[PDB]
Design a protein around this ligand. Structure first.
Ligand SMILES: Nc1ncnc2c1ncn2[C@@H]1O[C@H](COP(=O)(O)OP(=O)(O)OP(=O)(O)O)[C@@H](O)[C@H]1O
Ligand SMILES: [Lu+3]
Ligand SMILES: [Lu+3]
Ligand SMILES: [Lu+3]
Ligand SMILES: [Lu+3]
Ligand SMILES: [Lu+3]
Ligand SMILES: [Lu+3]
Ligand SMILES: [Lu+3]
Ligand SMILES: [Lu+3]
Ligand SMILES: [Lu+3]
Length: 841
């Protein structure tokens, strides 16, 4: 039995999730339900312990110091803020150390609990509340950087009652391979086929056995016992039995040998397989293919609980040569032995943990034993200061051991909310490397999401993103999302519903509109009146009147402005939508622009954009502001999603087309001429030129390190404020064309004033990233493994190593980047003209 209401609840949950989590149709064990049942406690333990008030106003703060760029603009010890009562308003100087209370307890003495209000950000759902210095608020810091006033408004604190959560042996190992079955055969000359079985741990193969090659029929039997050299008692918790079909790898499937319950896996199994799209997180999944009618299946038998709990010389000082912090530097049998033999000496240094645990022989019970003793005393580690870079490497595909991974997650615990937001996307992707559905990392994410609405809002869209287009991982992520959705609150549950409703309706339009004309780029007037009408059709009584903007939670969107909506003259025929701001206190009339697009895999864009945000914080710790513009983007489904529209900005390519020919030979003057005219007032033009210098640099260094600098002009944009920024990330060192150089004041290839400033920044920016080589290397490799198709592991990943110029000394590095800036100088328009040709051919 089950209370109708409850049943109805779980019904909406699944609607939010985008998948039916109750489904037990696709599970060969009760790990999903078991997990779906185990998270209930940690979730309820979070809801109960959080402060309903601070949770309702989700203050966004940071405990870091104000970088030079920000502090300098405070050479007054204080700062003022315009407070809006009603249509009223008054300025009040305040010191950087004032508390939100000391701000009102003071503001009221100037006019004259009597003070039953709170400070919110005009036209935003952002509150300055709690025992924190106003200088430690994110909003404040951003206003400072963008030299803007801090317009706040007096209003009543939200009611926490809106967030209330609804009511509740010893012999060797062997496996019998019975056979492979598939309904339809792939018309391909008819080849041979054999099954490969691997015992795998942390992406390493411990033992491997094969069957005899037979003709590729539709039912191929073997009934052969494959015996491995490993002994049951030596199978580590978290090992997988990888089953592959070859002839070229065609299909694969995995099965955890030791289950969530610590029991060896016995029984007959019929496992449905994944097909190779043509290394990455997907090949590691324990999920089976749900397409049980069309998929290849393999049948096996398993039949044989256990698991359930002097100071060296120069030699050892060569161990330090190995601990060369090179994440992408493999280890030799010799290297590993050295590391393991001198274990305890290696333990006295955190930066060597990854290398040390990768020298462990996980396939030997007795050794795993000593490892667990080595961890028993985590002094050097527990006392060490957090290093995300080091922590992330311990969460990647190379480590399957729960305790090793648990210490990494232990360090994450130290992260303040603002830091959890910079790495959240990558931590959610790292869940794919966990051997079991329930893990310390799945728990950490659940918790921080339940404790802070901002993180929760994002955890939600990152999880949903994957649930929607990832068969390999959607079950595990749904169970994680459901557990979050049973604790976020009724208010958020409502917000999520309105947002889900809106995108589900807008993408339907996006695609339908795409069919009407996915061939010729001739955007007709009818397709346009068509879009409008469709929008009118929804605007009626279906489309939610208002909703929070998925990539910017504090912004509230209202009615669509049908008059400004259009279909862009782009291959993908993206929709360009504009909405009003639902908030009356909005200190402006500017609309909220959002592009909806079908055709590009926006998950790659989400990953690039977040990396970029991480670089900005790295540069901040060093007091540098490259003016990047990592606009919001959220991947909603397979090749579909939304993009934040950066206001009054244009493509660099379009600029060339307007002045000069839309096909002719690009001109230099073009860009600067466009800027001058865009912002007449000679005082604003100067500043624009200043932005263009730093932003241009920021992107050149950023894109260069990411191996993504060579792109067409059409994928680069500029604001009427001088900000340059790259866009539309689908997948010469970088783009620094004559027109860019021109804006900096440089004809031919000589004179250089602003060019001087340019060079300087690039270097200081480049060498600032090098101080974080290990962090950038695990991020770059995790990105490739979780967001790119079948990659060239370590090969595709060996690029960033050269780009960061590992080993080489700073000065030599400085010169290496300087030469890169030079290769562009000599190339000029050659590359662009070729890209144009390419789009022509
Ligand atoms: N973040 C943004 N801010 C403002 N305008 C944007 C943004 N992203 C894209 N655009 C606009 O959308 C257009 C690019 O759209 P989109 O990226 O969908 O094109 P595409 O056909 O997919 O790309 P390509 O052919 O270069 O691979 C440009 O005309 C640009 O002005
Ligand atoms: Lu169902
Ligand atoms: Lu059961
Ligand atoms: Lu069951
Ligand atoms: Lu059951
Ligand atoms: Lu405007
Ligand atoms: Lu404008
Ligand atoms: Lu405008
Ligand atoms: Lu484009
Ligand atoms: Lu594109």
């Amino acid at each position: 039995a089950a209370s109708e209401e409850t049943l109805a609840f779980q019904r909406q949950l699944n609607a939010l999730i985008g998948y039916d989590v109750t489904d037990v149709s696709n599970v060969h064990d009760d790990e999903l339900e078991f997990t779906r049942r185990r998270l209930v406690t940690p979730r309820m333990a979070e809801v109960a312990g959080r402060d309903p008030k601070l949770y309702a106003m989700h203050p966004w703060v940071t405990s870091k110091p104000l970088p030079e760029y920000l502090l300098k603009k405070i050479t007054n010890n204080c700062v003022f803020i315009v407070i809006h009562r009603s249509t009223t308003s008054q300025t009040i100087k305040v010191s950087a150390d004032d508390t939100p209370g000391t701000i009102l307890q003071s503001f009221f003495t100037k006019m004259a609990n009597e003070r039953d209000f709170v400070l919110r950000v005009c036209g935003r759902d952002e509150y300055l509340v709690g025992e924190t210095p106003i200088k430690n608020f994110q909003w404040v810091r951003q206003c400072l950087k963008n030299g803007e006033e801090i317009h706040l408004v007096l209003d009543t604190p939200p009611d926490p009652a809106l967030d209330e959560v609804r009511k509740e042996c010893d012999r060797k190992f062997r496996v019998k391979i019975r056979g492979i079955d598939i309904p339809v055969l792939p018309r391909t000359a008819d080849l041979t086929v054999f099954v490969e079985a691997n015992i795998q741990y942390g992406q390493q193969v411990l033992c491997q056995r094969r069957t005899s090659p037979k003709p590729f029929t539709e039912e191929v039997l073997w009934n052969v016992w494959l015996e491995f050299s490993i002994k049951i008692k030596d199978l580590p918790k978290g090992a997988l039995l990888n089953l592959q079909i070859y002839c070229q790898l065609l299909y694969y499937v995995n099965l955890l040998l030791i289950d969530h319950r610590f029991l060896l896996r016995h029984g007959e199994y019929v496992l449905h397989m994944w097909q190779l799209s043509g290394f990455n997180a997907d090949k590691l999944t324990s999920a089976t293919n749900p397409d049980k009618e069309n998929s290849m299946s393999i049948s096996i038998l398993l039949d044989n609980h256990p698991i359930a709990l002097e100071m060296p010389n120069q030699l050892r000082k060569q161990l330090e040569a190995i601990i060369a912090t090179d994440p992408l530097n493999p280890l030799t049998a010799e290297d590993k032995e050295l590391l393991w033999h001198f274990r305890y000496e290696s333990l006295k240094d955190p930066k060597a943990y990854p290398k040390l645990f990768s020298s462990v022989k996980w396939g030997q019970q007795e050794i795993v034993a000593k490892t667990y003793q080595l961890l028993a005393k985590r002094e050097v580690w527990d006392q060490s200061a957090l290093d995300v870079g080091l922590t992330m490497q311990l969460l990647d595909c190379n480590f399957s051991d729960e305790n090793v991974r648990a210490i990494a997650v232990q360090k994450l615990e130290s992260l303040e909310d603002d830091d959890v937001l910079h790495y959240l996307l990558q931590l959610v992707q790292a869940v794919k490397f966990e051997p079991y559905h329930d893990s310390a990392l799945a728990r950490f994410l659940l918790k921080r999401g339940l404790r802070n609405k901002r993180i929760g809002h994002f955890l939600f869209w990152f999880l949903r993103s994957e649930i929607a287009q990832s068969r390999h991982y959607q079950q595990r992520f749904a169970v994680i999302l459901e557990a979050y959705l049973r604790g976020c609150g009724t208010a958020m549950l409502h917000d999520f519903t309105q947002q889900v409703q809106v995108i589900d309706m807008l993408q339907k339009v996006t695609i339908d509109i795409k069919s009407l004309s996915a061939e010729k780029y001739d955007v007709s007037s009818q397709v346009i009146s068509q879009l409008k009408q469709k929008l009118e059709n929804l605007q009626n009584l279906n489309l939610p009147q208002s909703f929070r903007v998925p990539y910017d939670p504090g912004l509230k969107a209202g009615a669509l402005v049908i008059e400004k909506c259009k279909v862009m003259a782009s291959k993908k025929k993206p929709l360009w939508l504009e909405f009003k701001c639902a908030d009356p206190t909005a200190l402006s009339n500017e609309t909220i622009g959002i592009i909806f697009k079908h055709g590009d895999d926006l998950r790659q864009d989400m990953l690039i954009l977040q990396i970029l945000r991480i670089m900005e914080s790295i540069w901040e710790t060093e007091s540098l502001d490259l003016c990047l513009l990592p606009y919001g983007c959220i991947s909603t489904g397979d090749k579909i999603g939304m993009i934040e529209i950066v206001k009054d900005a244009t493509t660099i390519a379009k600029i060339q087309q307007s002045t000069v020919g839309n096909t002719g030979a690009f001109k230099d003057e073009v860009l600067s001429h466009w800027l001058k005219e865009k912002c007449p007032i000679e005082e604003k033009f100067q500043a624009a030129v200043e932005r263009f210098v730093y932003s241009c640099a920021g992107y050149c260094v950023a894109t260069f390190v990411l191996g993504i600098g060579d792109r067409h002009n059409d994928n680069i944009m500029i604001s009427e404020t001088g900000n340059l920024f790259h866009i539309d990330f689908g997948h010469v060192p970088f783009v620094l064309t004559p027109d860019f150089l021109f804006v900096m004041g440089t004809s031919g290839k000589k004179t250089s004033l602003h060019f001087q400033k340019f060079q300087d920044v690039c270097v200081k920016a480049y060498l600032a990233l090098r101080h974080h080589t290990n962090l950038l290397i695990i991020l770059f490799s995790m990105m490739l493994m979780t967001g790119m198709p079948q990659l060239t592991s370590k090969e595709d990943i060996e690029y960033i190593r050269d780009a960061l110029t590992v080993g080489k000394s700073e000065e030599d590095a400085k010169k290496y980047f300087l030469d890169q800036i030079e290769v562009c100088r000599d190339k000029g328009w050659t590359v662009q003209f070729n890209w144009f040709l390419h789009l022509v051919l």
